[PDB]
Design an enzyme around this catalytic site. Structure first.
Site, PDB file in Angstrom:
ATOM      1  N   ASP A 151       0.801  -1.216   0.000  1.00  0.00           N
ATOM      2  CA  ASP A 151       0.000   0.000   0.000  1.00  0.00           C
ATOM      3  C   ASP A 151       0.836   1.270   0.000  1.00  0.00           C
ATOM      4  O   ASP A 151       0.296   2.365  -0.172  1.00  0.00           O
ATOM      5  CB  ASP A 151      -0.955   0.006   1.189  1.00  0.00           C
ATOM      6  N   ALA A 152       2.142   1.152   0.184  1.00  0.00           N
ATOM      7  CA  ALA A 152       2.941   2.342   0.404  1.00  0.00           C
ATOM      8  C   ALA A 152       3.375   2.963  -0.913  1.00  0.00           C
ATOM      9  O   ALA A 152       4.082   2.339  -1.704  1.00  0.00           O
ATOM     10  CB  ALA A 152       4.159   2.009   1.254  1.00  0.00           C
TER      11      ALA A 152
END
Ligand SMILES: [Zn+2]
Ligand SMILES: [Zn+2]
Ligand SMILES: [Zn+2]
Ligand SMILES: [Zn+2]
Lengths: 1114, 67, 48, 46, 216
Positions: free
Chosen positions: A734-735
């Site tokens: 998700d980063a």
């Protein structure tokens, strides 16, 4: 150009929404209040006379807000935005007129202020109402502000539209055990009252009614309600034949063992078990003793005079519970929207107003008397002018209410809490996000399974794209783009009309009813049971759409249960849509050219009998199409647009029909937390914590629902060239990973704004708190811990301040708070200077500093600070589409993927999000983006619609790009070709709240609570963190002793206690103090919470007296 | 607010190419793109801004202390 | 257990009610002028 | 412009006495600002 | 107030930077308080009468639109005049009246005794009498000398008209001022000469407002 019947349906909704605004819900109900109900409330109490001097009276006649009979609107008022700065309340005064009695043959009267109502922005009575774009400027306020929110004490808040259970209708709950309780909770003005009715044991069914005492057999009450034949009761409550014969027979049975012929016994047996009469007016203890209660307990629904109406009512209510006793299912579930009615801000005020007013009188009968006790000459002297003395119980009592949100209602003996919420401007969407939000309530505990999930009956009349996590006591919902909330209509006219169309009054109806047709119910009350259900309805609905009984008063058939309900109740959900009559639609395409030509508009169709609001139940009884491509002669209605199903916030999602739902729900939840332009008054306003973005941009793909809410003129987000590629390692889960020499080019740069208000307030000592300052030691410069201030001794404009600086210097008097006397030779002087300091992680700036004074005349200083946060590592970004994340490494420039036209994708996202989130609507939004920008037209896409994907590619391929986004990229950290392609085109990333520089928080040793002494909670206060009962177990499982003891003991509260070996108890220093010693005591250490328990125990009478032993020698 | 003075990626001077853009659209009624493409933005990194980017600063300048 | 220290089933009814120390009963901060916020128990026993 | 500060609506520069009134001079409007300092201030661009 | 146990330092700085909240002196370095413990979150004849005085006090308070401030200012004055037992036997209104009055007098605001009575049928003498008596039974300073320069503000409020009145205000003010200087101000009921000034400056600003409309 012939207008296209398939598409041009779309041109309805804006005209619909242009005429009748997005929020009428808070507007129109507030208008209907300030115009109608206020006139009605005093029309209920216009007469007050206490008991003395039989010649006196005070007669209310007129109510007005802001018109003293001078000009059309108010002759004087205060601009709302200006009112938002001074912490004032935005108000228009109440005006009344009273014919009264003072002296001999006089009966004078006037126009008088009883106080000040806090009128709502963009109401009928606000200054803003119908002001054009320039008057907007002179009033220094936003044109695009939704409005419909009050403002008090300088904050605004809102009346959050509050959903409520159906009231004064029938509900039937089955269950295991039990025997299927029924309830009708019915209230009109006086005395909200519940009546629960249920079996006790084995077919034996009673009224449990807390008004009465308990448990009356239904046959008894049913007698006392006037049906005495008792063997036709089976024909009535039971039915014709069925199986209900024996099932019901038991309660009819032992009605026999007791009494008969109610004119004495049953009518009496009721009045025998009543509570006390509350002393006076007990005289009617009779055989008709309780006949009042039979006529009126809660049944002010029906009540009336002869007994047949109420009788057959309670009967037809008894039928449904024994029907449930025959089989489960076949019961109304408390869930779906049809049985839920919501109540807008107008009524929620009224129920508070008429209370505070009723109090105003109830005390005013008192203050009118202390004149009339003592016969001082001839007493007249109007007694009036005391009303101002006696006022603001109506104003201040109302302000404090609407600001705090605790509504005290003793009249209904029920006190709600937590109604209002601060209107939250983090963005333009949230500004209408606190609008169009429905607060669910009642429904008892949190886990209860019945009133929680989302039911399919909710289509289009409540947003299906969000029902977020905000539970607490009850779930929160949102209205649609199109909901017309039903107001009250009327009762008697629709009734006698229903007679005109050929029903027959309940009296002439004999015996068999359930046989004949179905029946007809009015607001949940039986009237005529007309013959020929169909023609009746079709006739009636034909009237609702033309000449009479308009908007609501809807009607629908029911098969399983035999009846046709007709409901006029207000506060009910509706929605427009188009009729297809007989063969096909009623539009015929000519009205649309007859529409956007400019002379048709909306509410004109309703007169023309084309489109009409439906009712939840009614659309259940209808058949509805979707696209005009589907019409069958069997059909009834077609929706005007499908995508109106999604709520206000949900509109931001492009292509919501290509995702799953949870990505939309997370979206509709977070999007209102993005950062944006707020409103055009953005800089002129000072609000407590206000974000905003430097270089906003339209979202490249627009969902048509944006243009309606004008989101594109106040865009929240950046429009960022992104590439989906796994990069570095920092990407991963998700980063995101951002780009320097890009973020440095003004991507996502935030400005933050805060304020700290300090009201300088004088003291009863005739003493003022002063702003002086600016010490300036050693010839010509102010000392650093101060510095940075100015000659005025107040913060100045535009100067860097950080940590120990002083941005407002506030000195308070010391002896002022003491008791002043008529003695001062010289000094009020001595001051304790308590300047407020800016404690923050980063330098910031002071820009706009306001000096003003509130209504009570006390100095008021409000300054606002700004710091512009560069989107530093660890910031939440979101993809409009349901994504979420935080930047990883910030790559420089040269690295990161590049390509043919050397563009260097700005955000570089991660692939793995897509498969297990399974959201492809984004990966369409990309292609639409690269498509649009190359042609130059913002390329629409929208829920259940928008620009098709397959003709997109032909916009690309001809212009030289792959028919999908996938395009070669040269890895900049190497310079070879990326061995697989990469897929990119501009997406719209809206930087969010939850900047890290706020949240990063740490502590060495900070404050301690005087009470417990543990580390104090949260940031702000200080720091220190939490090992919960849940977590502590962890370190146990490892078996770490010296760590645990090093944590829950030394690090937190390390404390010495002196205990006396003999008779173990705690003592200080030397002494034991229960036995004077200073000898047998041994020092040692112990968690301070543990001591605190030895006292808080030992105070309470108990003593864990400590034994002891030495550690060593085994 | 005002048109940024470079891209967020490609780094081409922009803010000038705004006023000439909007002037070029007002006079000479013409499409969106063909204006831009002949205004010298052949890349899309460059192009979105002039194409995107509502210009608020006027809708702010309505409200000003001086007046 | 009758160890002759606790005096057998007498104590179990209140006779001398001990007042907990002020450190159990922190007087709330003055908070802006001599009106000084109470704490609730001290109000209770101060009524007792 | 030149001196201490300004009204909101009147937009007329008002120099205020010590402990006088919160009124402006020209208009009857009440709230006011503190006009920007003349003192130098340093920003970095980046 | 304490002293460094080492340097014998007389001055302390608290240190709020690193969220220790130290307390240490420049010349020592030794702390003093670490760990800055910091908090969070009936029936009597006289006290009852004090509560009643609060109630009759609040009542008449906002009615004249006076500061929440000045009331609790004057409530103390009532508590004081109770000590000399001046307040025992005289009509309660006349007591709470002046007790509320002298306060807003000392603050130099616009409120007026003639204005102050009409809350009652009473005479602006009885109240004045009681007032001037509690001037004897207490001992009070000179300060409460009102001028029209204060009253012309509030009198101007209900005059309707438009922005011009503010101009009229300065037109009236310097007028009344000279009138005080020209020596025919003294020994007169101030509210009257104030209204006279208003009529003048109003006519000076060429408007038509009747005498009745002024004396209202
Ligand atoms: Zn001991
Ligand atoms: Zn570029
Ligand atoms: Zn001004
Ligand atoms: Zn020291």
């Amino acid at each position: 150009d012939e207008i296209n019947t398939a598409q041009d349906k779309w041109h309805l909704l804006p005209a619909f929404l242009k005429v009748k605004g997005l929020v009428k819900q808070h507007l129109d109900s507030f208008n209907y209040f300030v115009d109608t109900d206020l006139k009605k409330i005093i029309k209920a109490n216009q007469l007050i006379l206490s008991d003395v001097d039989p010649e006196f009276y005070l007669k209310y006649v007129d109510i007005r807000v802001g018109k003293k009979s001078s000009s059309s609107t108010k002759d004087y008022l205060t601009p709302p935005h200006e009112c938002r700065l001074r912490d004032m309340t935005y108000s228009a005064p109440i005006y009344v007129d009273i014919e009264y009695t003072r002296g001999r043959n006089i009966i004078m009267h006037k126009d008088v202020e009883i106080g000040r109502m806090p009128i709502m922005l963009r109401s009928n009575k606000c200054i803003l109402y119908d002001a054009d774009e320039s008057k907007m400027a002179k009033l220094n306020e936003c044109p695009l502000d939704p409005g419909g929110y009050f403002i008090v004490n300088g904050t605004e808040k809102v009346i959050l539209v509050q959903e409520q259970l159906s009231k004064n209708r029938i509900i039937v709950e089955a269950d295991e055990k039990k025997g299927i309780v029924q309830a009708s909770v019915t209230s009109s003005t006086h005395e909200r009252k519940s009546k629960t009715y249920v079996i006790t044991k084995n077919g034996k069914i009673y009224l449990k009614h807390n008004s009465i005492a308990e448990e009356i057999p239904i046959a008894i009450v049913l007698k006392a309600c006037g049906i005495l034949s008792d063997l036709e009761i089976m024909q009535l409550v039971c039915g014709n034949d069925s199986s209900y014969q024996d099932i019901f027979a038991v309660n009819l049975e032992e009605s026999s063992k007791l009494d008969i012929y109610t004119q004495q016994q049953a009518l009496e047996y009721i009045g025998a078990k009543v509570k006390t009469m509350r002393r006076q007016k007990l005289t009617i203890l009779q055989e008709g003793i309780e006949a009042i209660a039979t006529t009126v307990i809660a049944h002010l629904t029906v009540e009336a005079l002869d007994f047949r109406e109420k009788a057959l009512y309670i009967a037809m209510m008894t039928r449904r519970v024994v029907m449930a006793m025959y089989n489960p299912k076949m019961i109304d579930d408390r869930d779906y929207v049809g049985n839920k009615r919501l109540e807008l801000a107008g009524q929620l005020i009224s129920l508070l107003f008429e209370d505070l007013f009723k109090k105003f009188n109830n005390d005013f009968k008192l203050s009118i008397d202390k004149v009339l006790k003592k016969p001082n000459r001839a007493m007249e002297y109007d007694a009036l002018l005391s009303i101002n003395v006696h006022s603001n119980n109506i104003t201040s009592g109302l302000n404090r209410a609407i600001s705090t949100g605790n509504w005290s209602l003793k009249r209904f003996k029920m006190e709600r809490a937590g109604v209002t919420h601060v209107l939250s401007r983090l963005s333009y969407i949230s500004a209408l996000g606190m609008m169009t939000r429905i607060s669910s309530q009642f429904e008892k505990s949190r886990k209860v399974s019945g009133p929680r999930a989302l039911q399919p009956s909710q289509f289009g009349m409540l947003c299906t794209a969000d029902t977020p996590e905000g539970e607490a006591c009850g779930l929160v919902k949102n209205l649609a783009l199109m909901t017309h909330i039903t107001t009250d209509d009327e009762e008697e006219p629709i009734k006698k009309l229903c007679y005109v169309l050929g029903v027959e009054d309940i009296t002439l109806i004999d015996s068999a009813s359930l046989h004949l047709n179905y029946g007809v119910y009015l607001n949940g009350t039986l009237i005529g049971s007309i013959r020929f259900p169909t023609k009746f309805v079709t006739q009636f609905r034909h009237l609702r759409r033309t000449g009479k009984v308009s908007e609501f008063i809807s009607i629908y058939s029911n098969s399983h249960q035999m009846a046709v309900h007709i409901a006029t109740d207000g506060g009910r959900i509706c929605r427009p849509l188009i009729i297809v009559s007989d063969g096909q639609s009623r539009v015929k395409d000519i009205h649309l050219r007859k529409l956007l030509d400019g002379e048709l508009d909306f509410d004109d169709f309703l007169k023309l009998g084309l489109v009409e609001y439906l009712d939840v139940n009614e659309e259940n009884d209808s058949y509805i199409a979707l696209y005009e491509k589907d019409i069958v002669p069997s059909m009834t209605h077609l929706e005007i647009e499908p995508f109106t199903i999604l709520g206000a916030v949900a509109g931001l999602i492009p292509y919501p029909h290509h995702n799953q739902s949870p990505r939309n729900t997370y979206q509709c939840a977070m999007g209102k937390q993005a950062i944006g332009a707020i409103a055009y008054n953005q800089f002129k306003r000072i609000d407590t914590l206000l974000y905003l973005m430097t270089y906003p941009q339209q979202p490249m793909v627009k969902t048509k629902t944006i243009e309606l809410i004008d989101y594109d003129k106040l865009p929240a987000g950046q429009n960022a060239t992104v590439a989906v590629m796994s990069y570095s390692g920092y990407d991963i889960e998700d980063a995101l990973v951002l780009n320097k020499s890009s973020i440095d080019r003004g991507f996502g740069r935030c400005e933050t704004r805060r304020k700290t208000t300090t009201v300088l307030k004088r003291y009863a000592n005739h003493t003022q708190d002063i702003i002086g300052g600016m010490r300036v030691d050693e010839n010509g410069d102010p000392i650093w811990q101060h510095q940075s201030l100015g000659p005025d001794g107040l913060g100045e404009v535009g100067m860097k301040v950080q940590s120990g600086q002083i941005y407002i210097n506030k000195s308070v008097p010391t002896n002022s708070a003491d008791a002043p006397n008529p003695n001062n030779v010289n000094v009020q002087t001595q001051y304790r200077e308590a300047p407020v300091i800016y404690r923050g992680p980063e330098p910031s700036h002071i820009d706009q500093v306001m000096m003003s004074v509130s209504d009570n005349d006390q100095a008021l200083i409000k300054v606002l600070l700004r710091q512009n946060r560069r989107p530093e590592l660890g910031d939440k970004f979101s993809s409009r589409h349901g994504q979420k994340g935080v930047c990883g490494i910030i790559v420089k420039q040269e690295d990161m993927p590049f390509n043919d036209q050397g563009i260097v994708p700005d955000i570089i996202m991660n692939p793995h999000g897509f498969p297990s989130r399974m959201t492809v609507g984004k990966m369409i939004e990309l292609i639409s983006g690269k498509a649009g920008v190359l042609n130059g037209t913002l390329e629409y896409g929208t829920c259940f619609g928008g620009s098709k994907l397959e003709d997109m590619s032909k916009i690309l391929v001809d212009q030289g790009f792959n028919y999908s986004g996938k395009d070669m990229l040269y890895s900049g950290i190497t310079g070879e070709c990326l061995q697989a392609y990469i897929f990119f085109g501009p997406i719209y990333y809206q930087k969010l709240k939850h900047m890290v520089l706020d949240k990063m928080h740490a502590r060495a040793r900070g404050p301690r609570a005087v009470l417990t002494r543990q580390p104090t909670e949260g940031r702000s206060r200080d720091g220190g963190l939490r090992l919960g009962e849940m977590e502590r177990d962890c370190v146990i499982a490892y078996g770490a002793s010296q760590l645990l003891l090093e944590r829950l003991m030394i690090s937190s509260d390390a404390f010495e206690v002196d205990v006396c070996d003999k008779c173990g108890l705690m003592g200080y220093s030397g002494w034991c103090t229960t036995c004077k010693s200073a000898e047998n005591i041994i020092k040692m250490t112990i968690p301070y919470a543990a001591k605190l328990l030895f006292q808080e125990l030992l105070s309470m009478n108990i003593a864990p007296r400590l034994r002891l032993e030495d550690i060593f020698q085994q | 607010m005002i048109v940024p003075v470079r891209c967020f990626s490609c780094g081409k001077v922009v803010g000038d190419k705004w006023e000439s853009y909007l002037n070029l659209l007002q006079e000479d009624e013409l499409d969106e793109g063909t204006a831009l493409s002949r205004l010298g933005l052949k890349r899309y990194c460059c192009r979105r801004m002039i194409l995107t980017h509502v210009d608020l600063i006027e809708k702010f300048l309505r409200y000003n202390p001086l007046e | 257990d009758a160890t002759v220290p606790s005096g057998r089933p007498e104590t179990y009814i209140w006779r001398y009610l001990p007042a907990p120390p002020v450190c159990i009963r922190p007087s709330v901060m003055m908070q802006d002028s001599p009106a000084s916020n109470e704490d609730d128990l001290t109000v209770k026993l101060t009524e007792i | 412009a030149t001196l201490k500060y300004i009204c909101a609506e009147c937009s007329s520069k008002l120099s205020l006495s010590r402990t006088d009134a919160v009124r402006c001079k020209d208009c009857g409007h009440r709230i006011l600002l503190k006009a920007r300092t003349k003192r130098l201030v340093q920003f970095e661009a980046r | 107030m304490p002293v460094c146990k080492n340097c014998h330092g007389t001055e302390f700085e608290r240190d709020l930077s690193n969220a220790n909240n130290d307390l240490v002196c420049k010349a020592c370095g030794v702390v003093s308080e670490d760990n800055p413990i910091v908090s969070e979150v009936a029936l009597e004849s006289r006290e009852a009468t004090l509560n009643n005085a609060r109630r009759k006090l609040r009542a008449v308070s906002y009615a004249l639109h006076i500061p929440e401030y000045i009331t609790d200012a004057a409530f103390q004055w009532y508590k004081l005049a109770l000590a000399n037992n001046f307040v025992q036997g005289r009509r309660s209104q006349n007591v709470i009246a002046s007790c509320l009055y002298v306060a807003c007098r000392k603050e130099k605001t616009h409120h007026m005794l003639i204005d102050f009575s009409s809350r009652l049928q009473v005479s602006v003498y009885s109240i004045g009498a009681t007032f001037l008596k509690m001037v004897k039974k207490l001992h009070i300073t000179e300060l409460p000398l009102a001028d029209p320069s204060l009253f012309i503000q509030h009198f101007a409020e209900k005059l309707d008209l438009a922005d011009k009145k503010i101009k009229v205000v300065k037109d009236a003010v310097k007028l009344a001022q000279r009138m005080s200087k020209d020596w025919m101000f003294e020994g007169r009921r101030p509210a009257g000469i104030a209204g006279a000034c208003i009529l003048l400056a109003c006519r000076m600003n060429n408007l038509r407002r009747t005498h009745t409309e002024i004396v209202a």
